[PDB]
């Protein structure tokens, strides 16, 4: 049914917001950077 190029709606924002918490995490700014220090600097 679904046309694979048709445009997103609203609902899908939730989904596209998804996946990105589930990479990244609420301390994900912390983590990034102390490994870069303790693995460049």
Same mark, same amino acid.
């Given at each position: 049914? *679904? $046309?694979?190029? @048709?445009? &997103?709606? #609203? *609902? $899908?924002?939730? @989904?596209? &917001?998804? #996946?990105?918490?589930?990479?990244?995490?609420?301390?994900?700014?912390?983590?990034?950077?102390?490994?870069?220090?303790?693995?460049?600097?």
């Amino acid at each position: 049914f *679904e $046309d694979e190029s @048709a445009p &997103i709606t #609203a *609902e $899908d924002s939730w @989904a596209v &917001i998804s #996946a990105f918490f589930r990479e990244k995490g609420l301390v994900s700014q912390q983590l990034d950077s102390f490994n870069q220090f303790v693995d460049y600097t």
